[PDB]
A paper describes a structure:
Here, we generated high-affinity anti-NaV nanobodies (Nbs), Nb17 and Nb82, that recognize the NaV1.4 (skeletal muscle) and NaV1.5 (cardiac muscle) channel isoforms. These Nbs were raised in llama (Lama glama) and selected from a phage display library for high affinity to the C-terminal (CT) region of NaV1.4. Kinetic experiments by biolayer interferometry determined that Nb17 and Nb82 bind to the CTNaV1.4 and CTNaV1.5 with high affinity (KD ∼ 40–60 nM).
The third π-helix is on the loop connecting strands β3 and β4. CDR3, the usual major contributor for antigen recognition and specificity, folds as a random coil with a π-helix of seven residues that folds back onto β6–β5–β4–β9 sheet. Notably, the CDR1 and CDR2 present a positively charged patch suggesting that Nb82 favors an interaction with a large negatively charged surface on the NaV. The crystal structure of Nb82 reveals a long (15 amino acids) CDR3 for a llama-derived Nb that could possibly underlie the nanomolar binding affinities observed for the Nbs to NaV1.4 and NaV1.5. Notably, Nb17 undergoes reversible temperature denaturation, whereas Nb82 undergoes irreversible denaturation.
Author numbering: 1 to 128
The structure:
């Protein structure tokens, strides 16, 4: 049983960066896979990045390839999403989800534990 809270959202100029964090509360943080997802208004929620509990490299959507880095600090019960070279198309609510690493699922939508999401807006309008 784990509770998740995203933070680090904002409104950022095109070409800028953010780092989202997803803080877990509950037992055995080290036994959970964690996944980042994003949802734009009127669109299906989509996979961004996932990180496991082994040495293995994380997984990334083709939509972010190379721009994004997911990482975990097991001591801080925190997963991060560094987001570089942001574009307007990256605007969405970003969500973190957790599932026990031994459980196999067909979709990220089957992860049991979700945060409330953090809003990311990327704007080429120089209000910066």
């Amino acid at each position: 049983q784990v509770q998740l809270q995203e933070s680090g959202g904002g409104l950022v100029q095109t070409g800028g960066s953010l780092r989202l964090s997803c803080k877990a509360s509950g037992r055995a943080f080290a036994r959970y896979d964690l996944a980042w997802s994003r949802q734009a208004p009127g669109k299906q929620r989509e996979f961004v990045a996932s990180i496991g509990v082994t040495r293995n490299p994380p997984y990334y959507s083709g939509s972010v390839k190379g721009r994004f880095t997911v990482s975990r600090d097991n001591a801080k019960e925190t997963v991060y999403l560094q987001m570089n070279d942001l574009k307007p198309e990256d605007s969405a609510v970003y969500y973190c989800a957790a599932k026990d690493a031994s459980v196999t699922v067909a979709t990220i939508e089957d992860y049991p534990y979700w945060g409330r999401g953090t809003q990311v807006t990327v704007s080429s309008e120089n209000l910066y």
